[PDB]
Amino acid sequence: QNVGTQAAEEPLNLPISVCTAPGNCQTEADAVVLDSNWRWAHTTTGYTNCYTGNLWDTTLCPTPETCTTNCAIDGVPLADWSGTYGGSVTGNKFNLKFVTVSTNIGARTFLLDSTKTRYRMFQLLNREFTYDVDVSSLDCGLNGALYFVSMDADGGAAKYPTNKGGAKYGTGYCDAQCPHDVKWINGLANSKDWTPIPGDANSGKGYYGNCCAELDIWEANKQSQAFTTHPCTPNDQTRCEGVVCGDNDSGDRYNGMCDKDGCDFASYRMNDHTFYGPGSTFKLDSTKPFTVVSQFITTDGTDNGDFKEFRRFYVQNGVRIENSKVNFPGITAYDSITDEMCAATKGLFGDLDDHKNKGGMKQMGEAMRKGMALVMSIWDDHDVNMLWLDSNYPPTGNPSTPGVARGPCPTTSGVPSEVEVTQANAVVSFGNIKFGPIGSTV
């Protein structure tokens, strides 16, 4: 995309901590940038929309190349962050409102480095990543997500010279779902064969998808939470078409370059329904804030080893809370993501181990070694109504069959039109982000 001249781009300042030992950290003066999908797209030498509602203008965008020549994405000024997009920062806390009323629904954002010209790339192997979260106002159907993806640090600017904005304009998004709803891919409008998504007034799908590796630290609302590894072959940003995208709609979910299911550790799905929930007698009380700690263990305990284990623990009101465990007869009580856990649990659930097909923890680790961009988002789910996270999936499945039940939400929950009314004022908060060696962040 070209860059427009109507509004300066002003990312929100967000300090994080880089740590060397427990309680010995230094501030890193980073910032938050809005994903290019949420930006106004208009004519390069005017005010005329190139995209309105869920459609590209066919006169301006008869082809992707012409669209890209004629159109530009514009900046987010400071005033518009809260007023238009529902984003705000107080000290080291970042807040994202779900619906902001001209009416904005959801948000996806990235962490910029201290220069505000590149994404802050995190080399996560043999490191610990930690943050405080509040998901108390997110119920069934919503997801306040924090995760990493194998985006380029410059959003693709060096690879795709028609991308003028780079990381500064939140470009280059890709993930392990190979999404077609990304409006700008490889420096070009994804306007070919663009199709609105029914019941989604703001979104559509273009000819291409954009694939890359994804490490989900946090997919969650107050009812259920998960962390998940998604390797791809290769891991780096890859525009896809046809079978390579692994499109759900053509029966290709397991035929593409990315592991779409991922290998998940989701406490409720692993059959501990009392670990996490909205109340003081759950082990971890989702009505109150808490700290989420993630440790990425290698084979030799060094930065050069292969990724072998994703460990997790929590801190809430000064109380250390170890992760829940897998709880099925004849299955080891795993409390972390490893290749063995993935094989054993997917075996039990009858899920295809595409994680293993894509190179497993080792391949996931190669993405983490090269460095990944931090994503913070809030969203509802127009495909599957978040049932995969917090309900029975498939909805018609027996909840006593291992793998089906992922949370207590009813199978009628999560319809975007309903959650966008009922949960309009939901806000996820991510704060006090800390990064360092294992054992350094609490």
Residue numbers in the entry: 20 to 120, 124 to 464
Text lifted from the article:
During macromolecular X-ray crystallography experiments, protein crystals held at 100 K have been widely reported to exhibit reproducible bond scission events at doses on the order of several MGy. OH-cleavage from tyrosine residues is regularly cited as amongst the most available damage pathways in protein crystals at 100 K, despite a lack of widespread reports of this phenomenon in protein crystal radiation damage studies. A systematic investigation performed on a range of protein crystal damage series deposited in the Protein Data Bank has established that Tyr –OH electron density loss is not generally a dominant damage pathway in protein crystals at 100 K. Full Tyr aromatic ring displacement is here proposed to account for instances of observable Tyr –OH electron density loss, with the original myrosinase data shown to be consistent with such a damage model. To better characterize the reproducibility of Tyr –OH group electron density loss in irradiated protein crystals, we have performed a systematic investigation on a wide range of structures at 100 K. A subset of previously conducted MX radiation damage investigations have included deposition of readily accessible coordinate and structure factor information in the Protein Data Bank (PDB), providing an ideal database of protein damage series.
Regardless of the feasibility of a radiation-induced Tyr –OH damage event within crystalline protein at 100 K, Tyr –OH density loss is in general significantly lower than for Glu and Asp carboxyl­ates for doses >1 MGy, at which de­carboxyl­ation events were reported. Prominent Tyr –OH density loss did not appear to be a widespread feature of general protein structures, a finding that is consistent with the high energetic barrier for Tyr phenolic C—O bond scission.
